[PDB]
Amino acid sequence: SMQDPIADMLTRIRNGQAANKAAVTMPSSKLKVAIANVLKEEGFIEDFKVEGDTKPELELTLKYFQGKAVVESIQRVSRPGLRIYKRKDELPKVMAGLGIAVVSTSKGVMTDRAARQAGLGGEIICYVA
Amino acid sequence: PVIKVRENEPFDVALRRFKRSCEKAGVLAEVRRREFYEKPTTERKRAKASAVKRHAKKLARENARRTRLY
Amino acid sequence: MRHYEIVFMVHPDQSEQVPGMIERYTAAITGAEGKIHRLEDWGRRQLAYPINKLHKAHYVLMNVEAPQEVIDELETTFRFNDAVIRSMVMRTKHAVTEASPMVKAKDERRERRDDFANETADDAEAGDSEEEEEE
Amino acid sequence: ATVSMRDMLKAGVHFGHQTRYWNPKMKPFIFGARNKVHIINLEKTVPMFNEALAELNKIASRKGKILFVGTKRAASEAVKDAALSCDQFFVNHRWLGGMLTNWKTVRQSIKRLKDLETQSQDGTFDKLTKKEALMRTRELEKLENSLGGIKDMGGLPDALFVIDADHEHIAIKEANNLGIPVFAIVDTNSDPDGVDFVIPGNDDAIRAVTLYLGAVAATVREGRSQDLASQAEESFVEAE
Amino acid sequence: SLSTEATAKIVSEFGRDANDTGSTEVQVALLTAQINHLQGHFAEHKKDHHSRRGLLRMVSQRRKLLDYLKRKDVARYTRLIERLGLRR
Amino acid sequence: ARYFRRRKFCRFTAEGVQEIDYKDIATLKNYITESGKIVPSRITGTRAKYQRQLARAIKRARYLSLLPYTDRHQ
RNA sequence: CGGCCCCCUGGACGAAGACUGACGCUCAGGUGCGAAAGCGUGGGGAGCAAACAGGAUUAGAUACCCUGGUAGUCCACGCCGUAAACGAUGUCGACUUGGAGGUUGUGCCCUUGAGGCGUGGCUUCCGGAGCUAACGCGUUAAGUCGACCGCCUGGGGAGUAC
RNA sequence: AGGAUAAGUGCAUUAUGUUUAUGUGGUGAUUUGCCCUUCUGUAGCCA
């Protein structure tokens, strides 16, 4: 049933910003967090916390400029059954580098600027608009 | 067709308005037309459609005043 | 067990048959660990429209519980009973065996508005006033 | 000060009603229904009305012109009392569609009025047939009732005063496209959305809407009384 | 829906010794008793199609939980299929 | 005071008369014309449960001759 | 899917105690199964009716309209499950301001609107974000997306041919 | 033996509209608009 849980993460962020909501909370994962960490530091989300001893749960706050949204959508590219991989030399350019690609490299999850500065390739996860 | 509901004080003229409440409907109302088994649910059951008219008729008196059309 | 609220009426002249018949039907309910939870006799009453002819019949509300297996044989016997004119039994779901909607009108019948006559003595011999043959 | 909050409650215990419908986007300030009558949440409305009255004080010195809109038959007399003078304009015989966007045409029909009244009282059009004079007398009357308290208004007003949105939604729409700062009192089926300061309220109970209007006018107008004397003294430095 | 007296017999013999109804072995046994009763009905009533929907549910889950039980302990599986006397 | 539970004029503006019982004639006649037939449930302002359950309990009651089945029976 | 009732039995909604622990999603093939009539024989036939006769109608009247009137309609098993197989949504699943109706488990109310609140329910109106060419949808999507299958590539001729 | 009583809001040919055969084709009110409209018009434009 739950066949892509990062599509649900991004869809939770998307309805967050479109319905002008301040926070969005959900079930947590090591992958969800690792994507959210690059998004936090590039300011594509504002901040998050992780809490739940029984099962882990993530709460986050949304991308703004003045207090309502300036980013339209965040969508997944590599997905179930159609994984898309890019080389070090082939790391993407998203809105002429105003936007990020979150790229999971062999050394962990980072943004296209740090994968490039590293000279690593990998899986291109999700792009900003 | 004097209508079975009994008139106050018996007389030669049946008082055909004051008697009817729910008579003919559905049993003898679709007279001399072809009879179906399950059709009545969608042909005849028009209660929802008719409640919206009862609400609009009671609403407009007050609103005609409030718009200042009266 | 499941609860089946049976009410029935009986043809006047033939009412002497039921007082023998009732004591086997109750043994078939308690012999299967069911119960008879009231057994109210209503007296003779006037039918609105005749059922198997004649404008009168004699009323009993038995109020049964029994397992599903047994009531199926017992209902097919009552329906093909010549003494019974009609019976109706209502669904199990959310069913009452106490606190009768007719509780005052049953007492009234018995007290003051009955027949006081031999065919409605028989009806009470199949009623709360049970007289029964030895088995 | 805490007095603004005390006013909001004295007025607010009608709670409106409008049966059980209401409008989902006002929900945070809405308590759950008491037996199929809508009942408002009053505690979350008292901060609002005080914040709006503190902002009113400050625009007194920025403004020349108020336009009181959202009038209706029961509240018109209360709008007459809230303007007090000709730095405050009000419409009380209904707003008309395009009165700010097409102010241009109203100001031409105002020029027709002050003329056709000074002609009437002179005796000037009443000659010939009764028809030619009467079709003018009757129109002069329709105009006079509609325009009498907004007749001197030289241009698009500096702020917008809403006491009820139910039929006058359009006055709020156009004002926002002309870039005018909006001061709203919105009812239970209205939305809080898209204006600069809102008081969440309700449209019923003639005793509530009267108290909302008495309060707005004081903050803007005695800020304004002080402003006018100040302005002469400000202007005179230049000419010195 | 099962008779009370079967449901406790099934609990004593099947699942764990905690005497639960949730574990894979006793749910297989609870479906089987409902299947077994129904195939006895389904000697006739050959146009009874809304109840058949149910037959197919109870069979489909029985296949799945036995497939699960072979994905899990091979001991538990080899006992279960032989203690519950399943198929022909 | 608490727990009064169905004094009078309380739960519903039109009282629920029976639910699924049909043995008293007088609860049943609460919604039955002199023509010998049911008034519609939109007109009565009856609660739906008792009415939906009455459709079985009235067919039952006609079949045990507590009620007229038919116009002919006056 | 509509008289009312019993036997056999499915599927759904609530609630406590409690349990196993992705046992999941979709589905080429597939077996199983009908609104209606069609359809093989048995049972059954009251009424209505394709056909068939005749009237009535009229650019002439097979259509229009009427009267007579059979098979058919009704039950049981059996044969390919046909169409307008639908919210004028493929499936299911995850997420998204709500209010109220229709109506239902259940705690509580002066048990004071088919009522309210508390906490679940389907089902539906209303309208805010998004989406549409337009109607329309709107928390059960036709939004935000997710996976997998079915299927289209101008009309006519042809949903037939093969 | 009615525990069924002129009521239960009791109201609208009880929505459903109720007869009349046909008659060919096309046809109307003006750019060449130029592919172009502006980093001094201005805190040059911009994040």
Look up residue B7 and give its DSSP letter. Answer: P
Look up residue B11 and give its DSSP letter. Answer: -
Residue F30 lies in a domain: yes
Which nucleotide minimizes the distance between its C1' and the CA of C115? H1
CB C13 within 8 A of CB C121: no
Question: What technique determined this structure?
Answer: cryo-EM
List the single best residue of B68, B69, B70 to mutate versus D (max D Cβ within 10 A).
Answer: B68
Which nucleotide minimizes the distance between its C1' and the CA of E24? G20
Nearest residue on chain D to B65, alpha-carbon basis: D73
Residue F2 lies in a domain: no
Q: Tell me, in Å, how far CA of F70 is from C1' of G69?
A: 33
Nearest residue on chain F to B3, alpha-carbon basis: F35
Residues in C touching F19 (Cβ below 8 Å): 94
What is the least distance, in Å, from the CA of C132 to any CA of chain F?
26
Element (H or E) spanning E36, and its range? Answer: helix E24-41
Q: Tell me, in Å, how far CA of E86 is from C1' of G121?
A: 38
Q: Where are the domains of chain D?
A: 28-95+159-225, 96-147
List the single best residue of B2, B3, B4 to mutate versus F (max F Cβ within 10 A).
Answer: B4
Residue F5 lies in a domain: no
3-state secondary structure D93-123: CCCCCCCCCCHHHHHHHHHHHHHHHHHHHHC
Which residue of F37, F71, F74 is in closest CB contact with B22?
F37
Name the residue among E20, E39, E38, E21 with its Cα closest to residue E30: E21
- Half-sphere exposure of C8 toward its Cβ, with a 13 Å CA cutoff? 26
Residues in F touching C90 (Cβ below 8 Å): 20, 22, 56-57, 60
Chain G, protein-covered positions (CB within 7 A): 1-11, 18-25, 32-34, 36, 48, 76-78, 92-105, 108-118, 126-130, 143-148
CB C12 within 8 A of CB C119: yes
What is the least distance, in Å, from the CA of B50 to any CA of chain F?
10
Task: Judge residue A119's burial from the number of C-beta atoms within 10 Å of its C-beta, 0-12 exposed, 13-18 middle, 19 or more buried.
Answer: exposed
* C86 bridge partner residues: C9
Cα dihedral across residues D68, D69, D74, D76: positive or negative? positive
Helices (H), ranges, A1-128: 5-18, 30-41, 112-118
Interchain pair D72, B67: CB under 8 A: no
Q: Tell me, in Å, how far CA of B23 is from C1' of H15?
A: 14
Residues in B touching D73 (Cβ below 8 Å): 65-66, 68
What is the least distance, in Å, from the CA of F39 to any CA of chain B?
6
Residue with tokens 């309990």: F57
Token pair belonging to A34: 């690792």
Cα dihedral across residues A7, A11, A12, A14: positive or negative? positive
Residue F8 lies in a domain: no
Interchain pair F39, B3: CB under 8 A: no
* Strand C56-61 to C3-10 pairing: antiparallel
Backbone angles phi, psi at D194, to 5 degrees: 85, 15
Torsion (CA) A3, A9, A11, A12 in degrees, nearest 10: 130
Domain region containing F57: 19-73
Angstrom distance (rounded) from CA F50 to CA F43: 15
Residue F55 lies in a domain: yes
Angstrom distance (rounded) from CA D184 to CA D198: 5
Between chain E and chain B, are at least 3 CB pairs below 8 A? no
Nearest residue on chain B to F44, alpha-carbon basis: B21
Residue with tokens 């003078």: D85
Angstrom distance (rounded) from CA C74 to CA C6: 11
Angstrom distance (rounded) from CA F61 to CA C88: 8
Contacts of F48 (CB under 8 A, 6+ apart): F41
Contacts of A26 (CB under 8 A, 6+ apart): A8, A9, A12, A32, A57, A58
Contacts of C74 (CB under 8 A, 6+ apart): C25, C28, C29, C66
Token pair belonging to B62: 């007050």
Look up residue B6 and give its DSSP letter. Answer: P
What is the least distance, in Å, from the CA of B70 to any CA of chain F?
31
Distance of CA C116 to the CA centre of its chain: 19
CB C8 within 8 A of CB C54: no
Residue F43 sits at the chain B interface (C-beta within 8 Å) = yes
**Number of domains chain F is built from:** 1
Residues in C touching F22 (Cβ below 8 Å): 88, 90
Resolution of this model in Å is 11.5
Domain region containing C76: 1-92
Residues in B touching F38 (Cβ below 8 Å): 22
Tell me which residues of chain B have a C-beta less than 8 Å from any C-beta of chain F.
3-6, 19, 21-23, 47, 50-51
* D15 bridge partner residues: none
Which residue of F33, F40, F42 is in closest CB contact with B5?
F33
Residues in C touching F66 (Cβ below 8 Å): 48
Cα dihedral across residues D82, D86, D88, D93: positive or negative? positive
Name the residue among D178, D171, D168, D181 with its Cα closest to residue D63: D181
Domains, chain A, ranges and CATH? 1-71 (3.30.1370.30), 72-129 (3.30.1490.10)
Angstrom distance (rounded) from CA A92 to CA A113: 10
Q: What is the DSSP string of C95-124?
A: --SSS-TTHHHHHHIIIIIS--SHHHHHHH
- For residue D118, give Cα distances in angstroms to D111, D112, F26: 11, 10, 80
Exposed e or buried b for every residue in E10-23, given b needs 16+ CB within 10 A? bbeebbeeeeeeee
Which nucleotide minimizes the distance between its C1' and the CA of B29? H14
Q: After which residues does a break in chain F occur, C–N more than 2.5 Å?
A: none
CB B4 within 8 A of CB F71: yes
